[PDB]
Short mmCIF file of C-alpha atoms and ligand atoms in Angstrom, two decimals:
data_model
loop_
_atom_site.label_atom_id
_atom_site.label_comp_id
_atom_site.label_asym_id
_atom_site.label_seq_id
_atom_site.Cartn_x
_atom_site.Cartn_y
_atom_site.Cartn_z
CA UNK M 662 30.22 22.84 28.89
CA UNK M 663 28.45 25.58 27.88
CA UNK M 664 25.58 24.01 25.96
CA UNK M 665 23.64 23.68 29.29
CA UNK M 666 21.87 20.92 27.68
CA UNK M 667 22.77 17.36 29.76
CA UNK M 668 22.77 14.01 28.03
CA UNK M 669 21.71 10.52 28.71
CA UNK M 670 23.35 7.29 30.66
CA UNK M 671 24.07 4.21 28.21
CA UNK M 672 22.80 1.23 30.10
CA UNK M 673 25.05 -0.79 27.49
CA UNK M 674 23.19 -0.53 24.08
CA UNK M 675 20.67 2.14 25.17
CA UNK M 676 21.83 4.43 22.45
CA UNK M 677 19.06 4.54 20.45
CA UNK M 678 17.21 4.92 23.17
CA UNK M 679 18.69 8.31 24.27
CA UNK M 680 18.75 9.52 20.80
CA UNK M 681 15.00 9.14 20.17
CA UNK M 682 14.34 10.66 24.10
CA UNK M 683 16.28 13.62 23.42
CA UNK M 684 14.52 14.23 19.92
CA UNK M 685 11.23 13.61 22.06
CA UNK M 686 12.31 15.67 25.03
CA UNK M 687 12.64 19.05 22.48
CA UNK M 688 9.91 18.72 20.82
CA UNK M 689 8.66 20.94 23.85
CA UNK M 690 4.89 21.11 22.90
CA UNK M 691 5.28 17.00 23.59
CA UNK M 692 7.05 17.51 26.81
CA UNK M 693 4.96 19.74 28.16
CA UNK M 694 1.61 17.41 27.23
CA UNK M 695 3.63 14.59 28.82
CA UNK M 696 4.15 16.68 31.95
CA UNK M 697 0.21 16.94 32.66
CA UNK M 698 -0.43 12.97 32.58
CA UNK M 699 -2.15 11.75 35.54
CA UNK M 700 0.16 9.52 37.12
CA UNK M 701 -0.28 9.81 40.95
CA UNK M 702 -1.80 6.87 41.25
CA UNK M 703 0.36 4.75 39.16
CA UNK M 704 2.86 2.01 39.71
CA UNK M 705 6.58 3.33 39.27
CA UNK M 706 7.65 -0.39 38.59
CA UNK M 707 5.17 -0.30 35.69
CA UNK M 708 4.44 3.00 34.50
CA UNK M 709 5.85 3.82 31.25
CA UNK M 710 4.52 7.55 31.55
CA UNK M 711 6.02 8.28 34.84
CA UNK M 712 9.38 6.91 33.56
CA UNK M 713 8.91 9.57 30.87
CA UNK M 714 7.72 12.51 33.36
CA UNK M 715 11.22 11.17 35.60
CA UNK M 716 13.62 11.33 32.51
CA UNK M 717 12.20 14.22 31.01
CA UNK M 718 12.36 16.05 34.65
CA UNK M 719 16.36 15.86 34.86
CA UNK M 720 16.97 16.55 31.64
CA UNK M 721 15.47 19.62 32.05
CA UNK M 722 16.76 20.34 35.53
CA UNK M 723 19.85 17.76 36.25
CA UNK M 724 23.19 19.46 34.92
CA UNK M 725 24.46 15.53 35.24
CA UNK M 726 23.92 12.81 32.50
CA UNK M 727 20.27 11.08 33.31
CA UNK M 728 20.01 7.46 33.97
CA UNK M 729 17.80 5.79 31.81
CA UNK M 730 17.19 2.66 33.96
CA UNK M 731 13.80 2.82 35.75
CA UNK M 732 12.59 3.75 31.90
CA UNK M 733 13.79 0.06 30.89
CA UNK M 734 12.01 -1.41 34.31
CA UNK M 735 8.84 0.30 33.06
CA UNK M 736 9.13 -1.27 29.56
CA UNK M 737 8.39 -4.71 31.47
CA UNK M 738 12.38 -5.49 30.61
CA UNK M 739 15.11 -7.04 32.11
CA UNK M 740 18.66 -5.94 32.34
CA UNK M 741 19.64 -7.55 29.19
CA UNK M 742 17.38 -6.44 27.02
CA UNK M 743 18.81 -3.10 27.85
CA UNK M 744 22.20 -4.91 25.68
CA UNK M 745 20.45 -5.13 22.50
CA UNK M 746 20.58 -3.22 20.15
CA UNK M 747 17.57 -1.95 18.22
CA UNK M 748 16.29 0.22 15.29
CA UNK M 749 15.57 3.44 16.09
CA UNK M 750 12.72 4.15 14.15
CA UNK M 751 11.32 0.84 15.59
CA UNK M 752 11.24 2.38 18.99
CA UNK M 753 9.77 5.84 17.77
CA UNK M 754 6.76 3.87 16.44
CA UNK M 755 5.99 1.66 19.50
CA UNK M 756 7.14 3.85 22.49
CA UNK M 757 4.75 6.74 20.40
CA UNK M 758 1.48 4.30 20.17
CA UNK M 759 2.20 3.36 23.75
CA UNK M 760 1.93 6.57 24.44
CA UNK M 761 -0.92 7.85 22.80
CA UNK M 762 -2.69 5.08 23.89
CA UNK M 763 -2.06 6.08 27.75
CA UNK M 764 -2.81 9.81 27.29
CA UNK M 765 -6.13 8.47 25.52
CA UNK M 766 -8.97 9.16 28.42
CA UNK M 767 -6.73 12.21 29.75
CA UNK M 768 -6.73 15.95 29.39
CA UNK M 769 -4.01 15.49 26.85
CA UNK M 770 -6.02 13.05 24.96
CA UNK M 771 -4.61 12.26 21.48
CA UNK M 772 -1.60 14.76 21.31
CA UNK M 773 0.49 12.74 19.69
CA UNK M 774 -1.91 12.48 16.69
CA UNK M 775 -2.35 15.99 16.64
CA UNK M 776 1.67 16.53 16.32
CA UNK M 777 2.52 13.93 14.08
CA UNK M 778 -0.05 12.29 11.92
CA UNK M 779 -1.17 13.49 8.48
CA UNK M 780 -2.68 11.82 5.60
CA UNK M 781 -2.25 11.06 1.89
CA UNK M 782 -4.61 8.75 -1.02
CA UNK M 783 -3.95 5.82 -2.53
CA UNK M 784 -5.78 6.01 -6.50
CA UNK M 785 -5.58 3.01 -8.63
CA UNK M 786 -7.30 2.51 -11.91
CA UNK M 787 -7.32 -0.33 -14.56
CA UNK M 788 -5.23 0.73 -17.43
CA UNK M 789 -7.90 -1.45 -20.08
CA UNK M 790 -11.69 -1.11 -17.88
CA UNK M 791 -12.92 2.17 -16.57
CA UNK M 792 -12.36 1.30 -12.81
CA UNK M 793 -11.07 3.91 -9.93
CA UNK M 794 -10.71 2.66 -6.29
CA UNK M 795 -9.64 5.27 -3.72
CA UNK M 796 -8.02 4.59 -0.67
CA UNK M 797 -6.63 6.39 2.46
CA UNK M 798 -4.21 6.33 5.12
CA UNK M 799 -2.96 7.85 7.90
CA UNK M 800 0.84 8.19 8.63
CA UNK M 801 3.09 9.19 11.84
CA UNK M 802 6.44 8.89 9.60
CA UNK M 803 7.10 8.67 6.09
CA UNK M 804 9.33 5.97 4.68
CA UNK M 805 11.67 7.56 1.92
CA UNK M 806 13.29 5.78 -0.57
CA UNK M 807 17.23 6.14 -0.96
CA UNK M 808 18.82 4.18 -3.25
CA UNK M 809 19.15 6.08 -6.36
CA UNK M 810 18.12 9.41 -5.35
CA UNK M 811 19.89 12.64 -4.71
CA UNK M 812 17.74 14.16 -1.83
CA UNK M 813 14.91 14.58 0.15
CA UNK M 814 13.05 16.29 -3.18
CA UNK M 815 13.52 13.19 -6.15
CA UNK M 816 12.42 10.83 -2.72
CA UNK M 817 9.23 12.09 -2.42
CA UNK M 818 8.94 12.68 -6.41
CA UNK M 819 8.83 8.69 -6.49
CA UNK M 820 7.05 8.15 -3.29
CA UNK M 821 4.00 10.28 -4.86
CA UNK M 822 4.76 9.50 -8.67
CA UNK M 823 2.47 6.77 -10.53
CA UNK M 824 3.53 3.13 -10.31
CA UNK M 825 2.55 -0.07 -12.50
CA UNK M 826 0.41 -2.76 -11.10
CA UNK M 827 1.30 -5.31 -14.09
CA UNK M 828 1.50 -9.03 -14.50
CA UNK M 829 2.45 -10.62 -11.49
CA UNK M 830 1.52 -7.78 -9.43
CA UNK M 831 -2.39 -7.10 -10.84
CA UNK M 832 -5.61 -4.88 -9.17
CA UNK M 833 -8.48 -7.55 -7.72
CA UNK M 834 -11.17 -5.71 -9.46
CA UNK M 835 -13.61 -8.39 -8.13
CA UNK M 836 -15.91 -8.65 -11.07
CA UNK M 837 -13.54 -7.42 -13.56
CA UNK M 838 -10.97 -10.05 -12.25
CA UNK M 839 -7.30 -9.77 -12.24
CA UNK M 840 -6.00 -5.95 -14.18
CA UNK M 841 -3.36 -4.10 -14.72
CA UNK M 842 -3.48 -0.87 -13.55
CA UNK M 843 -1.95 2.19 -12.01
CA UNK M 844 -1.56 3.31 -8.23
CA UNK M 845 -0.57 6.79 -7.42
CA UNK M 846 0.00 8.31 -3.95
CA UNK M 847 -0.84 12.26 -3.17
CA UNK M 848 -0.68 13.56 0.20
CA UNK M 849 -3.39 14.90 1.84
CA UNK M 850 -2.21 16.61 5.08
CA UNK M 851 1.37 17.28 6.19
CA UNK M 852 1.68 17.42 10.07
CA UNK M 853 3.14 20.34 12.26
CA UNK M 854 6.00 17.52 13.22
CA UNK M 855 7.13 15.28 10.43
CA UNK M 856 9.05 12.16 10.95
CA UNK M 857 10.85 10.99 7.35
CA UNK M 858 13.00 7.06 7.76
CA UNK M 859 15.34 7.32 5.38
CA UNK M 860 15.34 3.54 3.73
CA UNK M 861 19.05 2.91 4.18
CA UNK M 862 18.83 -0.61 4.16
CA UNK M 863 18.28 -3.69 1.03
CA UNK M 864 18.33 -7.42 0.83
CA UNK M 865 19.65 -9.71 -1.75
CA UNK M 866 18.13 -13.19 -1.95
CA UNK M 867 20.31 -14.69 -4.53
CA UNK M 868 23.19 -13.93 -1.64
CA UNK M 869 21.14 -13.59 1.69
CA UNK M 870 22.23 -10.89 3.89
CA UNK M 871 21.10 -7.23 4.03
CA UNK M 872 22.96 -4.52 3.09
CA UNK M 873 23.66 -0.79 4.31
CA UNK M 874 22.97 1.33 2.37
CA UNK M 875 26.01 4.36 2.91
CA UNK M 876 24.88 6.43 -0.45
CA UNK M 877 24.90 10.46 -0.53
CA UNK M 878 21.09 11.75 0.24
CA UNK M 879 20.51 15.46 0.47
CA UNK M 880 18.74 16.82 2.85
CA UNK M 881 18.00 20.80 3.32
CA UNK M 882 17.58 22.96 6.40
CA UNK M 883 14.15 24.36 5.14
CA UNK M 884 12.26 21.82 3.40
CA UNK M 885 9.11 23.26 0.85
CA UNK M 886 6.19 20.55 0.24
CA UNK M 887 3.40 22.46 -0.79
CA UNK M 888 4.59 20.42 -4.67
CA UNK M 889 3.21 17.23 -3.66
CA UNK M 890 -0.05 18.24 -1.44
CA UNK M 891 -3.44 17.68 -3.37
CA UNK M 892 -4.64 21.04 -2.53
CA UNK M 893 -2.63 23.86 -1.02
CA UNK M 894 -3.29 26.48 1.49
CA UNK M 895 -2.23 29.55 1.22
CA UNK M 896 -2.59 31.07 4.73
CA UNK M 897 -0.26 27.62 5.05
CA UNK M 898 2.24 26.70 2.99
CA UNK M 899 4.39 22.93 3.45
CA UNK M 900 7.41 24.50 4.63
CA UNK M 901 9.18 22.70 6.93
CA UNK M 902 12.52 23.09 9.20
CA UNK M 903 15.06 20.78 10.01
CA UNK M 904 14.92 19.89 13.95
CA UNK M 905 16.65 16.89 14.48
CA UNK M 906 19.00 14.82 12.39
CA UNK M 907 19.05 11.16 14.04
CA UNK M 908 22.39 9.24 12.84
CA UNK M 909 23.34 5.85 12.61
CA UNK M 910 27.16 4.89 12.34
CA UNK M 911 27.90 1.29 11.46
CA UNK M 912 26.58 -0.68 8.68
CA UNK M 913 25.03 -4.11 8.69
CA UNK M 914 25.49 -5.72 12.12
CA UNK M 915 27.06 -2.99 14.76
CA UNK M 916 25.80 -0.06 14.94
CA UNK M 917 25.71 2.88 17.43
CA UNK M 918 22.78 6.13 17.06
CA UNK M 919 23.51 10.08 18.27
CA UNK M 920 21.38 12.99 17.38
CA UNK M 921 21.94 16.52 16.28
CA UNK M 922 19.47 18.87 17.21
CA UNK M 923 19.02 22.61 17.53
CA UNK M 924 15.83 22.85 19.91
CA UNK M 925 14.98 26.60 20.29
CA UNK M 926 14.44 26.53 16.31
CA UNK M 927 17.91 28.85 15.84
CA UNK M 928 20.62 27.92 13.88
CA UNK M 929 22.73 26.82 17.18
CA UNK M 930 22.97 22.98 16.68
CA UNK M 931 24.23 20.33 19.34
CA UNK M 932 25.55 17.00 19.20
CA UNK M 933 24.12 14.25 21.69
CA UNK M 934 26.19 11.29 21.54
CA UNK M 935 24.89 9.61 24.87
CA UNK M 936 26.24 11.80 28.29
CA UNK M 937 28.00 14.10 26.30
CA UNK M 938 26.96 16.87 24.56
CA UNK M 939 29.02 19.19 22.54
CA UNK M 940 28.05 22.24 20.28
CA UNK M 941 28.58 21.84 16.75
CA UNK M 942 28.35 23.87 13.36
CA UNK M 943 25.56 23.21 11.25
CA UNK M 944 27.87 21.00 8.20
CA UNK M 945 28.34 18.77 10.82
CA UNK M 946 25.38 18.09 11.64
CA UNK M 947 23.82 18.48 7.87
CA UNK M 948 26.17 17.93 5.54
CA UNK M 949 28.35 15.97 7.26
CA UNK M 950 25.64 12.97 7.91
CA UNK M 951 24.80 12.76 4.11
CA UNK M 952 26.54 9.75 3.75
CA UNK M 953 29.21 8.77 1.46
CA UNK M 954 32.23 10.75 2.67
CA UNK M 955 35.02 8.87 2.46
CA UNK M 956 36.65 7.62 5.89
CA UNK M 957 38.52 10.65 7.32
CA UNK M 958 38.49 12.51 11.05
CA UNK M 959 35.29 14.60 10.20
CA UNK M 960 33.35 12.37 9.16
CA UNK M 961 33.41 8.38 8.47
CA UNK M 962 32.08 6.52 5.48
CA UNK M 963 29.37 4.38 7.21
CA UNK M 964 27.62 7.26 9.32
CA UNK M 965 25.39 9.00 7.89
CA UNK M 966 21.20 9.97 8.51
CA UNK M 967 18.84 7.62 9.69
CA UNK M 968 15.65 9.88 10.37
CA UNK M 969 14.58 13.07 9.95
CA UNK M 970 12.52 15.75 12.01
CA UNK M 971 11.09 18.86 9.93
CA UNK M 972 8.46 20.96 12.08
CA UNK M 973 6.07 23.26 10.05
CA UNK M 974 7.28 26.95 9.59
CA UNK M 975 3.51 27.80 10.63
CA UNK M 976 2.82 25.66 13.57
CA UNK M 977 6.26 26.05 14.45
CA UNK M 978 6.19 28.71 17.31
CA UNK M 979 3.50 26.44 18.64
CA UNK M 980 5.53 23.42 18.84
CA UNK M 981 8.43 24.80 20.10
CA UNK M 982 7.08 26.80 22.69
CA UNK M 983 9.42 27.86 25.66
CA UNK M 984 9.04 24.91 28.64
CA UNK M 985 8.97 26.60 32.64
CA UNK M 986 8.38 25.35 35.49
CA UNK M 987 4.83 26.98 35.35
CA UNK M 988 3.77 24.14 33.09
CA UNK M 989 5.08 21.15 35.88
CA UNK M 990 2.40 20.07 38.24
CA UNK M 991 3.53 20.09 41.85
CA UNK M 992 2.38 16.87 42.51
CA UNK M 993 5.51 15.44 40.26
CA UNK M 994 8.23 17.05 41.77
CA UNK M 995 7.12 15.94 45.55
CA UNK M 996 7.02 12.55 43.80
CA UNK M 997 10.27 12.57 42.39
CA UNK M 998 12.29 14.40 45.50
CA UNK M 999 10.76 11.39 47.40
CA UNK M 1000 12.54 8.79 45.32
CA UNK M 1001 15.79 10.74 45.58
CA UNK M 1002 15.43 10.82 49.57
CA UNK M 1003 14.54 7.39 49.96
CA UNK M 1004 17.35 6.43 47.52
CA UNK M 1005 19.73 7.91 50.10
CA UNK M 1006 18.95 6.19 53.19
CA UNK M 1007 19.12 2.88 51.22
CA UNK M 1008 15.78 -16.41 23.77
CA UNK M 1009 16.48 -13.05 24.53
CA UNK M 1010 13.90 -10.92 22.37
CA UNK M 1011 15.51 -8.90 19.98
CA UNK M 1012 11.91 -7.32 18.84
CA UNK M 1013 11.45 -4.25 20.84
CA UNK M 1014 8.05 -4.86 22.70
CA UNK M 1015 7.02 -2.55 25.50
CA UNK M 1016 4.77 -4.58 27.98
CA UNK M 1017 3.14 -2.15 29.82
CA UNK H 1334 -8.77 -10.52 -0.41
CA UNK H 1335 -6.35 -8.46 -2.03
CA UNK H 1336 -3.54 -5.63 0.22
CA UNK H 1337 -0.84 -3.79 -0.61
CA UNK H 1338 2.44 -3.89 0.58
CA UNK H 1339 4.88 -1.05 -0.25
CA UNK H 1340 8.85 -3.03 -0.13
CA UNK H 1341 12.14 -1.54 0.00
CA UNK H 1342 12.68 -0.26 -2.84
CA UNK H 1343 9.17 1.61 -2.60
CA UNK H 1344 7.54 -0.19 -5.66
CA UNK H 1345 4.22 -1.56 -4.28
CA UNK H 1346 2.91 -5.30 -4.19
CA UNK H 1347 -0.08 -7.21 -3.65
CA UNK H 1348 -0.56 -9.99 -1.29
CA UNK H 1349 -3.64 -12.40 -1.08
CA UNK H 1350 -4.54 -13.42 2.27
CA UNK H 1351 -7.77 -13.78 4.18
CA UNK H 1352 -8.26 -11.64 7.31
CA UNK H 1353 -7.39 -14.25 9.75
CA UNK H 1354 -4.29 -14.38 8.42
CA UNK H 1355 -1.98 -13.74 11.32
CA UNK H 1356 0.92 -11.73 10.47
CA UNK H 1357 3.05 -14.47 10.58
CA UNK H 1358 1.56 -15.91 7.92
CA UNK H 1359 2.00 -11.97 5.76
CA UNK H 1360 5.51 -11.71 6.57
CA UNK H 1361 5.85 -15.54 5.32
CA UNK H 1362 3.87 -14.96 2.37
CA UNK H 1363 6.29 -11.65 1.70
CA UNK H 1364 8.96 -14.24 1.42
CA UNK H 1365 7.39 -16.43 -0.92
CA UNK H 1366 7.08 -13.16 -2.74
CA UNK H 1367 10.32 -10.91 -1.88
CA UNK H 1368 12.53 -13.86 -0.58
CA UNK H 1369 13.01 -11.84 3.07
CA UNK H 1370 12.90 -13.85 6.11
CA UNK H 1371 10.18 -13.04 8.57
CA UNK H 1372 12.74 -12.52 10.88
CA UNK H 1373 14.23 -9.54 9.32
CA UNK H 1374 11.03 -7.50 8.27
CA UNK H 1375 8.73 -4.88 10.35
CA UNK H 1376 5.65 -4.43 8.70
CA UNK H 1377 3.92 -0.74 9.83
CA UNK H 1378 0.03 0.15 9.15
CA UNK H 1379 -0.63 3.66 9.62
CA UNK H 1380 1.70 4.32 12.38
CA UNK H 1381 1.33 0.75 14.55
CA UNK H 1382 4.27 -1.48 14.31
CA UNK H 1383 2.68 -4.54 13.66
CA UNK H 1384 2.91 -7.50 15.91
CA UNK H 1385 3.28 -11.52 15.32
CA UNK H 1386 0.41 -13.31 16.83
CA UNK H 1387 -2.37 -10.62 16.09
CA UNK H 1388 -4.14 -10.59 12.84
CA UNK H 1389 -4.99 -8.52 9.79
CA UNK H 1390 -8.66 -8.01 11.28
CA UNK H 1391 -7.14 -7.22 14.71
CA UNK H 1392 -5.67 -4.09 12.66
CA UNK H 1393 -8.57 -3.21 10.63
CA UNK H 1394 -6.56 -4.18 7.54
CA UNK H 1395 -9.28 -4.61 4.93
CA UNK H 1396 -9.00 -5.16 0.73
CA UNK H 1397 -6.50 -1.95 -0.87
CA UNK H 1398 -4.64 -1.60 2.54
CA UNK H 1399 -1.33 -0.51 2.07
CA UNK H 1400 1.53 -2.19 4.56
CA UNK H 1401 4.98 -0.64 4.77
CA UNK H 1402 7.77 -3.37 5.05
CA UNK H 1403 10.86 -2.09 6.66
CA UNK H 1404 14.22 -3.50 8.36
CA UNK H 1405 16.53 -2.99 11.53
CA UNK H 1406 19.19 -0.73 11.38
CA UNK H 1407 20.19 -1.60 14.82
CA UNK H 1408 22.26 0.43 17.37
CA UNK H 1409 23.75 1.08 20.43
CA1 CA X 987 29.71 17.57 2.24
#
């Protein structure tokens, strides 16, 4: 086809997987920090970076689908683990900490932070004594609540809007003892690449299961924050893109994960369902995964947007940046022609843990 | 001492536990609290999934720190 871009192998429930790679793969400022890891010493057997460097490699230069099995090998798995099926999300947040904590005494040192991590505050104070804590954290995704809310805009509204902290739920004021009070959440910093899991999930205890949750949420293509910062900057206003629009089709127990994307930042989006890759209009990649439409051949009732990618309009150029050949050490590609040469001649966990 | 953990729904709870605590014993005391199995929840702290076995210290999780509980939406 003539989207030039090549897809993934599906080892059997790998999906997932390849969704989360390919949203990894384009966000190029990544790929290129991921390119300069020093691996020539490491253990292909073990090394989850040079898996990385190896998948990234063909997917920028195969035009055939990329296997996806010495990336498994390298998680410290065996071949079933590469049949279960597992949250996406999950894997962003332990594949990315994995990460950064193997660039961490490198030249790329702490990338990852400097993509994806921002920060907000955490104020509570007593409704009857005069008593303000402050607290803050740090964030590499933002979890959004769905139910109940038309888009991306209300979400946030009651993510940063005041809550109650009453009866069974009271502040420890320590000497003041037990107190009702009032915890409010402002954000601080929003990062150039911004990672939003849209909660589409419950549980009931009076019936014990958990539920999908298959509700319209609206999401835009251009995404203004500067609202809910403490203090805005006007050299730099919150605006974000949309980059990536990871999907989830199923509901409660099956499930299978495909991405859109469009990479260069354009409007041109692209649909990677596993190997394939098609082009696609921007409804179906947008409007099409709000969820709640209804059963028919566009678009089915249980598939809709799992997590979002938004990269800021300023830092945008930056993160995107165009990906040659001039920013591949030599050393990798003797490594990896190698393996291709030699080649020639010739309770299962269902937690997600990478072991190396 | 006294953490927060931010459910489902988004509204925000508190939890007593000690650091020691192993997060075994958080997600269990979550259910005494939210009736959800251990099984089923992920519990995230600033970006790091965390992990059964380690314990709230081992994560620097001190009085006022905020946990976000989350599920599985698994996939192939
Ligand atoms: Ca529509």
């Amino acid at each position: 086809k003539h989207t030039g871009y090549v897809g993934l192998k599906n080892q059997g429930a790998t999906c997932y997987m390849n969704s989360l790679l390919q949203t990894l793969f384009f966000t190029n400022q990544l790929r290129k920090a991921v390119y300069m890891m020093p691996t020539e010493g490491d253990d292909s057997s073990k090394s989850v970076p040079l898996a990385l460097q190896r998948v990234f490699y063909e997917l920028q230069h195969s035009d055939k689908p990329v296997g996806t099995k010495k990336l498994t090998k390298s998680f410290g798995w065996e071949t079933l683990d590469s049949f279960m099926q597992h949250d996406v999300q999950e894997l962003c947040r332990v594949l990315l900490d994995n990460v950064e904590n193997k660039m961490k005494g490198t030249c790329v040192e702490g990338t990852i932070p400097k993509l994806f991590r921002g920060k907000m505050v955490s104020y509570i104070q007593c409704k009857e004594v005069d008593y303000r804590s402050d607290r803050r954290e740090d964030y590499y995704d933002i979890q959004l609540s769905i139910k109940g809310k038309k888009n991306i805009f209300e979400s946030f509204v009651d993510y940063v809007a005041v809550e109650q902290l009453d009866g069974d739920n009271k502040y420890d004021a320590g000497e003041h003892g037990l107190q009702e009070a009032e915890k409010g959440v402002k954000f601080l910093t929003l990062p150039p690449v911004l990672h939003l899991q849209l909660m589409r999930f419950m549980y009931d205890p009076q019936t014990d299961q958990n539920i999908k949750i298959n509700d319209r949420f609206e999401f835009p293509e251009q995404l203004p924050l500067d609202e809910f910062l403490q203090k805005t900057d006007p050299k730099d206003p919150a605006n974000y893109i949309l980059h990536a629009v990871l999907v989830h089709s199923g509901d409660n127990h099956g499930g299978h994960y495909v991405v859109y994307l469009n990479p260069k930042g354009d409007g041109k989006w692209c649909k990677f369902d596993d190997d394939v890759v098609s082009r696609c209009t921007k409804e179906e990649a947008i409007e099409h995964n709000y969820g709640g439409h209804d059963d028919d051949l566009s678009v089915r009732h249980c598939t809709n947007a799992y997590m979002l990618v938004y990269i800021r309009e300023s830092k945008l150029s930056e993160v995107l940046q165009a990906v040659t050949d001039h920013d591949i050490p030599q050393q990798l590609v003797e490594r990896l022609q190698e393996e291709k040469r030699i080649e020639a001649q010739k309770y299962l966990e269902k937690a997600i843990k990478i072991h190396n | 001492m006294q953490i927060f953990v931010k459910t489902l729904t988004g509204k925000t709870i508190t939890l007593e536990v000690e650091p020691s605590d192993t997060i075994e014993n958080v997600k269990a005391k979550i259910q005494d609290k939210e009736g959800i199995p251990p099984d089923q929840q992920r519990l995230i702290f600033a970006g790091k999934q965390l992990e059964d076995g380690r314990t709230l210290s081992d994560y620097n999780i001190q009085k006022e720190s905020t946990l976000h509980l989350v599920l599985r939406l698994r996939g192939g």
